[PDB]
Amino acid sequence: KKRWYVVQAFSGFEGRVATSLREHIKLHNMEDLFGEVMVGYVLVQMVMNDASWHLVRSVPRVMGFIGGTSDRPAPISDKEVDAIMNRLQQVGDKPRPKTLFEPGEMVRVNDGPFADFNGVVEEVDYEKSRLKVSVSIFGRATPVELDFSQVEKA
Template structure:
């Protein structure tokens, strides 16, 4: 028999899945928690992913990328029944766990709520992230703006701001220009 637990006992856990099976595991776990009447103990299942914009042969394409391939986040009250339901869902290989001193088995380790909030806020922002496949010293062609079609050398990459500093030759002098990732392409 399960003891009564409160919503304050809800914690986030990382569940390991087969890589590439995260969405299927989420669907299966959602179905199982509904059919077993455990929506109050397993409240959310998340597959954190974000959109990325990639430039391929001059064309921009958007694709969805999982932030943690092979893992999902589950908000739940950890008790034997909920653990068993999650652990025995098709595609789940286990929880991220740690051994407790004197314990008989490893226990799932809950995540800090702030960490999960940061992850979910990043995903919820909905802004696609530009992916740049270049590093300092690469030669690039500027594809947009007043310097379009000019060649330059990557001086600096700032992934957080989505910008790249490129040195171009203007009147025989190297001049730095800051551009968005989408304004340059690797030569």
């Protein structure tokens, strides 16, 4: 059974640390003592012998493990939470809000000179794919037609 551990690298050379770590594994052929390497912190599926500990700290541009002590360094705590966040990440970020504003509903403009402005859709045109919303420019409402993607639903 291989448990997880946290490695600190020089932040910025992290992919090169991961590649050099895989290569040191396949050099010193302790292939049965390493499972994966996940990407300033590098996650390593590993077991704990002092030989494998010296192996990971002899990988270049690696400071050391992060744990309770340096004798017996520490596996993890909320590893499941980290895995869940990694699975989402881009998926969670993706939103793409389009103007679903109907009669009276407020919308947001992010394209053309009217970008960075909000307003309400007094009239909507699904057939012409156009929303009739006015922007409060210099006080007076500026009824302009914007596409669903041109504006966001507020």
